[PDB]
Structures are given as C-alpha cells and as structure tokens.
Amino acid sequence: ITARTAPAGGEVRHLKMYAEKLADGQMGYGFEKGKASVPGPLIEVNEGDTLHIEFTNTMDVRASLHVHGLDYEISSDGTAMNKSDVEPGGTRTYTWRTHKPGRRDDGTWRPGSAGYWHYHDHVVGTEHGTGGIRNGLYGPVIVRRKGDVLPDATHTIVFNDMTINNRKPHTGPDFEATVGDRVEIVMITHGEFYHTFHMHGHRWADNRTGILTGPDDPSRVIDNKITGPADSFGFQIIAGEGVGAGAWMYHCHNQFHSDMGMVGLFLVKKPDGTIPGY
C-alpha cells in the first residue's frame, strides 16, 4: 500500500473543550474559547488511545458531552441522571477509552472501538439534549484501527432535522477537491427526521470504513444510505474516480427535503483548478 496508514494506538491524549453560546443563538463546541464550530471540532484517535477531555461549560445553562462507540465509565456518560453534566461556568473532565479487538478468555471475539462516531450534548433543552443538539452541540469522532488508510482531507456532513450542518436551506455546505484526492466524509444524522444521503458520481462500501478489504469483502456498494437520528457512518472516495471533474451534487434524496434545501456541492476540480461548466 502506497497510501498512509493509521499507526497502532496506545497514547494518552489530553484535550481542552468548551461549549459557547454563539452570537446567532446557536451553541457550539470548540477547542479554543471564541473558536467554536457547528459541527464542533473533529476528534480523531487510534484504538488503544485514551482521551481526557477537560470540558468547560461557558454557557448560562447546564450542558454535557456524550459520545458514541467509545468506552466510558458511567461518570462520563454525560447525563443528568448520572450526575455527569456540567453546570454553567463549570469544568468537568471526561475520559474516553478505546480498545483493540481480540479474543476473550471464553474464546469469543471482542470488537474493537474503531469506527465513525460522534459526540453531542445530553442535557440542554431536555434530558436527551434535544435543545443542545438542535442548537449545534454535535461533532464527529473517528477511531482508527492500525492499518486504516488515511485520507487527504476529512469533511463532516450532519443532517440535523432538515438542515446540513445547521445551515439555512440551500446554502451548501459546498467543499472542494481535485480529481484524484482521497476524500473522507463523516456523515451524522440528528433530530427527529429520517434521511437518505446520496452523492452523484461516487459510491462507497456500506461497511465500517466505506472501503472493501479486497475481492472477498462481501459488503454491498451503494451511493444512497438511509440514516436515522444519531446514526453515524463514514467513507472515503477518490474524487472524480472514473467520472472526472465537475460540480457533483450531494443531498438527502427525500424529494421533500431536497426541495426544501438539503443540498450541497462536491466541487471536484481539474488539475488547472477548473470545474466543467464554469
């Protein structure tokens, strides 16, 4: 493999995180005060890493951090129930652990933590984070397995109710690649709606990594994936592979949601920077 690959994990990483109310009314996570995003920052790690996150709630209401997929103790589940949220102005340290797969004492196979996951608030608005999530308190988490192929860039598309990334309808987000790039997309759904994520000109494997191991990988290949609230998948694609440059559309294929604004562009450029038709 001429491509970069993920190393074996086992680091103890540290991370400061904030929750901020944004001037537009939204709420967002950030790694630096004043630099909060919706979606929030991407956290990326290797199976075996441990992550300590000193999370500071800079808001006037309680807020929390809840993650999918990773190992955490109940003290870190981010729920009011388990006394795990954070009061206004407070600071709590959360810990996420990840393990490699392997055989258990009983001969059964323990799955690893690798995958395309995500984190979100669990206590704003309701004890399930309905307000925090609607407001933008969600972000992606990637856990890589030793050997995983690494992309040239990672992009996060979140269908949150009937928006992408909390944007006004019909305003993207667009993003750009050059024909040939190894583009990784993290796709997360939130809210009370169901969607189908469709991408013109490109397809991927409906498995953990979006990539087939080889000739024996039985995973289906698809260009259209159904998604429900708190579902998260990812894939990698070769921008324009076999199809060339262009303004490639991505959208929710729900005809109503398409019409109502859930559309963006994957702008795959030629080596000279141009996009056929423009």
- Cα torsion angle, 181, 171, 115, 197, sign: negative
14 is in an annotated binding site: no
* CB-nearer residue toward Cu ion: 58 or 160: 160
* CB-nearer residue toward ligand OH: 163 or 232: 232
251 is in an annotated binding site: yes
99 is in an annotated binding site: no
Residues 61-90 that bind ligand OH (CB under 6 A): 66
190 is in an annotated binding site: no
Residue 65 near Cu ion by CB under 5 A? no
Residue 254 near Cu ion by CB under 5 A? yes
202 is in an annotated binding site: no
* CB-nearer residue toward Cu ion: 77 or 148: 77
CA distance 135 to 219: 35
Choose among ligand OH, Cu ion, a copy of itself, none what residue 106 binds, the Cβ cut-off being 5 to 8 Å by kind: a copy of itself
- Residue from 134, 190, 195, 202 touching Cu ion (CB under 5 A): that is 195
- Residue from 198, 225, 257, 269 touching ligand OH (CB under 6 A): that is 198
Residue 118 near ligand OH by CB under 6 A? no
* CB-nearer residue toward a copy of itself: 42 or 243: 243
Q: List contacts with ligand OH (CB under 6 A).
A: 66, 122, 198, 253
Residues contributing to the annotated binding site? 66, 68, 120, 122, 195, 198, 200, 251-253, 257
Q: Binding site for Cu(2+): which residues? A: 66, 68, 120, 122, 195, 198, 200, 251-253, 257
